[PDB]
Amino acid sequence: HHWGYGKHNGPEHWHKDFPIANGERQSPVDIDTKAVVQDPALKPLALVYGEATSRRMVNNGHSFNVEYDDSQDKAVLKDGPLTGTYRLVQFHFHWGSSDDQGSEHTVDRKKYAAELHLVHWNTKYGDFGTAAQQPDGLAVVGVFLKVGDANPALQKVLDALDSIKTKGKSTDFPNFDPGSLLPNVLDYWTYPGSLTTPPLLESVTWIVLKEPISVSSQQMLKFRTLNFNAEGEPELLMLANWRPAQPLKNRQVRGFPK
Ligand SMILES: CCCCCCCCO[C@@H]1O[C@H](CO)[C@@H](O)[C@H](O)[C@H]1O
Ligand code: NA
Ligand code: NA
Ligand SMILES: [Zn+2]
């Protein structure tokens, strides 16, 4: 089923083909900081990314992603709110049509310019697809991009976008350290949720970092010159690819260290 962020096939209509869009643990959410609860079971996050091996970058038609080699046991996410060990498979971003919107998660309704999603799958399920079908199968780390200074690490990613302008395009993208896109402080909010794109599976433990990384307004321009369409289709620039906040319903957002 074709979906996107346009007038006819956008977040407002996803429910027609993916009825879990109106499920009980949908993402993203607004994080009401006064309602955040502390939990002494929570641990510091362990993002063990030093041996993560990037492979390629791909315009998938809804955003772009950097693919990691998840056939080896090296780049893993553990601790934080998690039991067991999750392999890094890819990262991607969401952004908006102007600098003051574009994040998926919001903090007391504040939006950032963009949001990075580092996607991981629980090693006990063997692969990404199998893991995606279990409530404890995925873990996504979300990082806010706040407009300010130019980000040199981010620039390596943005430099490659000229190579992947349209849907299905890919380029070799070796040696990129995903940790170079994390803040120094790993304080986080966590809640049980879902993928923010169809198929919207409710299999994600969300880990949203409190501290953003920076991006310049000039860098933000680079995101918005990508195309949703394939070559030879009408041009639909990737001006915005964010889902609005979804009802928290009966969930609680936990915070570490508070
Ligand atoms: C619509 C609900 C399911 C969407 C998630 C896609 C998960 C795909 O799951 C994949 O399936 C393959 C074929 O069965 C298996 O070979 C893989 O091991 C599995 O990773
Ligand atoms: Na692959
Ligand atoms: Na290619
Ligand atoms: Zn995402």
Numbering used by the authors: 3 to 260
Cite, word for word, the article reporting this structure.
A well-studied carbonic anhydrase II was selected for rational design as it has efficient CO2 hydration activity and could be heterologously expressed in Escherichia coli. Thus, to better understand the key factors controlling halophilicity in enzymes and to develop a halotolerant biocatalyst for hypersaline conditions, we undertook rational enzyme design by selecting just one of several mechanisms present in halophilic enzymes: increasing the incidence of acidic residues on the enzyme surface. Herein, we describe for the first time the successful redesign of a mesohalophile enzyme to an extremely halotolerant orthologue, that is, one that is active at 3 M NaCl and above, by altering 18 surface residues. In contrast to suggestions that large differences in accessible solvent area, non-polar surface area or absence of large hydrophobic amino acids are the important features that allow halophilic enzymes to function optimally in high-salt environments, we have found that increasing the number and distribution of surface acidic groups alone is sufficient to impart this characteristic.
Crystal structures of WT and engineered enzymes were obtained to confirm the presence of changed residues, that active site residue positioning was unaffected and also to compare the overall structural similarity of the designed proteins with that of WT. The structures of the four engineered enzymes superposed almost perfectly with the WT enzyme (maximum root mean square deviation (RMSD)=0.42 Å for M4) with no significant differences apparent in their secondary structures.
